Design a protein around this ligand. Structure first.
Ligand SMILES: *[C@@H]1O[C@H](CO)[C@@H](O)[C@H](O)[C@H]1NC(C)=O
Ligand SMILES: *[C@@H]1O[C@H](CO)[C@@H](O)[C@H](O)[C@H]1NC(C)=O
Ligand SMILES: *[C@@H]1O[C@H](CO)[C@@H](O)[C@H](O)[C@H]1NC(C)=O
Ligand SMILES: *[C@@H]1O[C@H](CO)[C@@H](O)[C@H](O)[C@H]1NC(C)=O
Lengths: 289, 100, 276, 10
């Protein structure tokens, strides 16, 4: 006899944002009370009967907490239902952001693993890794302390498309565990493969004199709707593919007016899946005189 | 969306005999989406220990479920199945007809 | 006889009412033999027919791992389908999946199947050649382009030609005494008046396996297919099935009507008539 | 036994 509690659009919410708690019980979204973990059996707001979902807006730090709901059950020894599943509202933006980096890198072969390392010069007690999206839950790790930084290694994988996307990480300090830092700079984690690798080539070719034009052509018999041109160490270009007479799919990346060059690979991708890339093309080295 | 209202059959596992243990079945099928509420009723009152089969579907993608409970039929007792579904404004009751 | 194995997946979003939910069931012919439900506590593939229960722990661990993986896959495919059709994140949607194989009496593959649906309508299907797809709309054409670029048909084909047939042959052995023994229907005819000049004859078939059956009413040998009311074949709850067929007849003409029953468990078709 | 489909997306 448990209600189902949920937060929308995200239980991880910036301060000043908005989150709605919904309590669904016996085919209804009404007539329920809320409780916080530290003070159970004492309803919040002096026992406010929520006749509708609870919209917290704008979100403040006082909204952060670990919630359960009980729905009105009129013929019962308490008059109320059992406690719902717990939902933890985490309010972000309350400390300087940590940093997030991928080892060995953010392009992850299908089936393989990647470490996402969160770290800060602030002594965070816990670190949270959150993948962008509606109704997405964070992973938590204790912060390890060494050499004046705290850090945590989040292991992601075996990589597949459900794990690809934009990640951010967060720190919390000892006595405000439901208050999170500002988010780290975002990191896009991309899965490469198993879509077949395209072909890379340059026009007129890979040897460019100063002041001459170089265009990089990514090509495939697969119908990629977009190609990503990726340079070793840089520069991340995207272009739509166009179908050619010989049935190849192709995008032409003009370089210049003074690109210095380097080794290039290209990847195909598809509409509405921006973090699923094909296998990398064979590399192509461009040298500007 | 394509929404399909449920078909309902109420019947016993074996030919009913007053005083002999049996099983009361309510077979629901042809419906979409899959959320559905099914109650077996005795004299209008919901029977408690009702089980149902695992959700599956037909080649046309509509769902079917069997709801069942052990019961000893009597002449004094009236059984039915009560079904509610988004395609139904109001719950639909099908009486168990022993004759057929 | 011929035999088939099918797996059916239902993946459902239900925003604000539950977590995204993944349900899988496995069938040999008309007999359900396994299930997985991500809503249970500690989801796992579980036996649903006695003849699978003595598969070892290596079987269930591999099945449970596969189902957990597919639940994660199809939870995300629901989000993808939202973008393909430009639908709100507040509504409830359903993906359905079917695959499996048909084998002949020698146990060799006759054909493979793999079809997908979104919100109860065809979405994409593997063709009979097991190496190409047919897409039902422009959203599914995106999926087709992706599955072509990833050579997904080759993986379906390897399974359908290999493990699918191999396991189906194993399950048919495990449950031979129930899966390959046709139980004939028990039959009778009932009579009920509807007025002072018409009555219903109802031909009953009970307790039969497998579910395939033909019930017909004839009058002077002519098939009354248009005047016959046939109910959907229905499960008895004990892995047998039930069906009936009814015709409305002028009172006094009942002797003209015969019910005909065909079923794998009958060595010859049955003819029935009603008698007071 | 069920089909094991590695990493396949719609
Ligand atoms: C939230 O409270 C529940 C008890 O209601 C507890 O089991 C759970 O671990 C708590 N979660 C956190 C993140 O503290
Ligand atoms: C909750 O409040 C926010 C802020 O005004 C608003 O954007 C939103 O529409 C409201 N309702 C829901 C269900 O989020
Ligand atoms: C985290 O991972 C990186 C790269 O894998 C490694 O160099 C580092 O030592 C790890 N940190 C800890 C605390 O294990
Ligand atoms: C297809 O045509 C394009 C455009 O001229 C060309 O770059 C590419 O090499 C051709 N591919 C093949 C396989 O002929």
């Amino acid at each position: 006899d448990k209600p189902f509690l949920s937060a929308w659009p995200s239980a991880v919410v910036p301060r000043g944002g908005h989150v709605t708690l919904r309590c669904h019980y016996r085919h209804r979204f009404n007539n329920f009370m809320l409780y916080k973990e530290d003070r159970i059996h004492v309803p919040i707001f002096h026992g406010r009967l929520f006749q509708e979902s609870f919209n917290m807006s704008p979100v403040t730090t006082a909204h952060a907490g670990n919630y359960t709901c009980r729905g009105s059950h009129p013929h019962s020894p308490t008059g109320w239902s059992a406690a719902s599943n717990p939902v933890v509202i985490m309010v972000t933006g309350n400390h300087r952001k940590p940093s997030l980096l991928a080892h060995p890198g953010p392009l992850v072969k299908s089936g393989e693993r990647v470490i996402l390392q969160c770290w800060s010069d602030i002594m965070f007690e816990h670190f949270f890794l959150h993948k962008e999206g509606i109704s997405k839950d964070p992973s938590r790790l204790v912060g390890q302390i060494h050499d004046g930084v705290s850090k945590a290694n989040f292991s992601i994988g075996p990589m597949m498309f459900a794990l690809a996307g934009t990640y951010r990480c967060y720190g919390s300090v000892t006595h405000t565990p439901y208050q999170l830092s500002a988010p780290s700079d975002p990191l896009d984690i991309v899965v490469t493969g198993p879509y077949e690798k395209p072909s890379l080539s340059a026009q007129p070719g890979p040897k460019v004199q100063a002041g001459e034009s170089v265009t990089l052509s990514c090509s495939s018999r697969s119908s990629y709707d977009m190609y990503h041109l990726s340079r070793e160490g840089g520069h991340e270009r995207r272009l739509p593919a166009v179908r050619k007479v010989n049935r190849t799919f192709q995008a032409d990346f003009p370089l210049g007016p003074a690109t210095h060059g380097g080794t290039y690979r290209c990847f195909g991708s598809f509409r509405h899946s921006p973090y699923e890339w094909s296998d990398p093309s064979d590399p192509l080295l461009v040298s500007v005189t | 969306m394509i929404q399909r209202t449920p078909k309902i059959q109420v019947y016993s596992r074996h030919p009913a005999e007053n005083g002999k243990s049996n099983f009361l079945n309510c077979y629901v099928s042809g419906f979409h989406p899959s959320d559905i509420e099914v109650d077996l009723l005795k004299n209008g009152e919901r029977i408690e220990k009702v089980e149902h089969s695992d959700l599956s579907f037909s080649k046309d993608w509509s769902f079917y479920l069997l709801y069942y409970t052990e019961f000893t039929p009597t002449e004094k007792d009236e059984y039915a199945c009560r079904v509610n579904h988004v395609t139904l404004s109001q719950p639909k009751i099908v009486k168990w007809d022993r004759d057929m | 006889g011929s035999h088939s194995m099918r797996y059916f997946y239902t993946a459902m979003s239900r925003p604000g009412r539950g977590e995204p939910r993944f349900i899988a069931v496995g069938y040999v012919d008309d007999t359900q033999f396994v299930r997985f439900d991500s809503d249970a506590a500690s989801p796992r593939m579980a036996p649903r027919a006695p003849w699978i229960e003595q598969e070892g722990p290596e079987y269930w661990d591999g099945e449970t791992r596969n189902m957990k993986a597919s639940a994660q896959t199809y939870r995300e495919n629901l989000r993808i389908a939202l973008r393909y059709y430009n639908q709100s994140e507040a509504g409830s949607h359903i993906i359905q999946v079917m695959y499996g194989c048909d084998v002949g009496p020698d146990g060799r593959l006759l054909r493979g199947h793999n079809q997908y649906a979104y919100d109860g309508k065809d979405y994409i299907a593997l063709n009979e050649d097991l190496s190409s797809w047919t897409a039902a709309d422009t959203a599914a054409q995106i999926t087709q382009r992706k599955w072509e670029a990833a050579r997904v048909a080759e993986q379906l084909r390897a399974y359908l030609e290999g493990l699918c047939v191999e396991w189906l042959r194993r399950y048919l052995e495990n449950g031979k005494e129930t899966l390959q023994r046709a139980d004939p229907p028990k039959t009778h005819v009932t009579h009920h008046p509807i007025s002072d000049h018409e009555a219903t004859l109802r031909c009953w078939a009970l307790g039969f396996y497998p579910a395939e059956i033909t019930l017909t009413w004839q009058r002077d040998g002519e098939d009354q297919t248009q005047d016959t009311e046939l109910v959907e074949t229905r499960p008895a709850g004990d892995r047998t099935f039930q069906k009936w067929a009814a015709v409305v007849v002028p009172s006094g003409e009942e002797q003209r009507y015969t019910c005909h029953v065909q079923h794998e468990g009958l060595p010859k078709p049955l003819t029935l008539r009603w008698e007071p | 036994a069920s089909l094991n489909l590695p990493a396949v997306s719609w």
